[PDB]
Amino acid sequence: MIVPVRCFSCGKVVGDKWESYLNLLQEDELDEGTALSRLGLKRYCCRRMILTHVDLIEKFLRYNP
Template identity: 70%
Template sequence: MIIPVRCFSCGKVTGDLWERYLQLINDEGMPDGDALDQIGLKRYCCRRMVLTHVDLIEKLLKYNASEREAHRAMRRV
């Protein structure tokens, strides 16, 4: 869901690196390994935290329950 704040194995802070990682691979077209090296993730445990993260929060925000209720209320009127 949300990028973990710390590496589960060593405790290094990884939460603040997610946006920079996405910028490097999407905007600059950099390979994953090079992007991880550039943001300072050298240990394989920390690299795993970023590489295996699935960003579901954007997909979940599309299904906002309050908007669905408002739409149902409008249809009843």
Template identity: 70%
Template sequence: MVIIGDKWNVYLELLGKDMSEGDALDELQLKRYCCRRMVLTHVDLIEKLLQYNPMERSKEKPQFS
């Protein structure tokens, strides 16, 4: 069984070294199309989602009494 959750950052590093997507996936030993699809179609949204954390927004707003 292949686990791909820990390969995202390595994949980005390989792309940063001007490696093609296919070669980067081969380097990560992701041969099956289902695993390759998971990496190729991933959208990294965590930074955007953190902006919408209601607890964080309440810290920034002044409290009125």
């Protein structure tokens, strides 16, 4: 639904950086690896925790109610 608050494995906070990741992907047109590394995720656990998210909250949100 929403980006997870913390990395499941290490517990690093990754909910801070979802919109920064989207901005680096769209505005700056950086590849996935560069965007993640510049956001400061070194461990592949955190890196997949941001890379594999699906922004299902948008789909659920923009119904009527």
